[PDB]
A paper describes a structure:
In the best-characterized E3-E3 pathways, ARIH-family RING-between-RING (RBR) E3s ligate ubiquitin to substrates of neddylated cullin-RING E3s. The E3 ARIH2 has been implicated in ubiquitylation of substrates of neddylated CUL5-RBX2-based E3s, including APOBEC3-family substrates of the host E3 hijacked by HIV-1 virion infectivity factor (Vif). Structures of ARIH2 alone and bound to neddylated CRL5Vif-CBFβ reveal the HIV-1 hijacked E3-E3 ligase assembly that overcomes host restriction and defines mechanisms by which NEDD8-linked CUL5-RBX2 activates ARIH2.
Author numbering: 58 to 127, 134 to 493
Amino acid sequence: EYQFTCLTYKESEGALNEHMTSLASVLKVSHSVAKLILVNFHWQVSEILDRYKSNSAQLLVEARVQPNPSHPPHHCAVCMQFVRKENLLSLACQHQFCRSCWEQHCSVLVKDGVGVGVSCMAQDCPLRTPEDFVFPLLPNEELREKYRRYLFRDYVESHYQLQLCPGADCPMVIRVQEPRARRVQCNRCNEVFCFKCRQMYHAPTDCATIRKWLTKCADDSETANYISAHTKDCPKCNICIEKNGGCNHMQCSKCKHDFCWMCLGDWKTHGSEYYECSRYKENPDIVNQSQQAQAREALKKYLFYFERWENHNKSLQLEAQTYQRIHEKIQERVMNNLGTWIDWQYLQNAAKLLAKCRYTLQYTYPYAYYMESGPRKKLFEYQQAQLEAEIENLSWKVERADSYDRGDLENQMHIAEQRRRTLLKDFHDT
Ligand SMILES: [Zn+2]
Ligand SMILES: [Zn+2]
Ligand SMILES: [Zn+2]
Ligand SMILES: [Zn+2]
Ligand SMILES: [Zn+2]
Ligand SMILES: [Zn+2]
């Protein structure tokens, strides 16, 4: 699995303070300056030391500590009033302003949730106020504690090895030794998410691609109001069949016809060998046609992928309900002394494996939509077809568990898991 850790806010504070003190000792700088450097360089100590040896002036400028190199005032530039010399503060940029206006500036910014990003009051000036400068300018303790909380938030966000738990009101931090776009789960609120973008787990797609896909699903006119079909007419009977299970292999109870929920085409074409339902039938010479036909083809392709994305989500939901009913039936058998949980554990294992596999499959479709043509896309489409075929086989067998024995169900489990593993090892990239 992915090697991650769940730390409390106290442990995270301790780790961050250790890093700060080490860097402040090494660089012969104050703690606030060291924090500024660490935040600007995402707490990557190696790059910080390398660039400090390369150009210390450029490092202090980029970290917003010193102004770019390329007699008092007694007049604050924002309140226009004359003030005392001691009540006239400034950063290294020497932009001087009076103490009352500094207090007002910091108080407003902190009240608006700003932590690290408090900057000089002069336009364009990139300098950022260090902690030891802001803290005396905050009068009350709730303001100082708000500032500390926002600073800790910004520190965990900027730290390349740490991420705040997206769970609502969850005071946990997820730590990772080598940050990648992989699945993590907080052990206090059970929130699952991708480590890189802090959104829903989305393998094999990367973070940018899935963000684009979600925005397109929500914004495009043809999909913003989309509702998946609850019922469909049997290709043989025309009877209104309802989709209650997650398995897309439907058998009409009236005529015994086996068809596919996405196609309305017969199921004997949807075996593991020669699985075609998941590939988009692309047009090769449609780049050489009119803009009308090109836009129509773009709509066709987008809908082909989006409908399967949506239907696999719906199937995940329906299969979760099926798993709940299975759990209830095993509970009933156990209390009736018809067996024990160990003898039906294979069924719940199959259900969890099916959920995992169909999650992966659901996310394979944005990946296939945003892929460019070529042999890599053909390889991905073959692996995706194998995954989908074995997934629908496993879901059929899980929905009808009393008609199948332990052996073939575990075999289908292993087959679907192997297909999912192959897809992930080939296409879950950096
Ligand atoms: Zn002023
Ligand atoms: Zn300034
Ligand atoms: Zn959590
Ligand atoms: Zn991500
Ligand atoms: Zn029928
Ligand atoms: Zn199909």
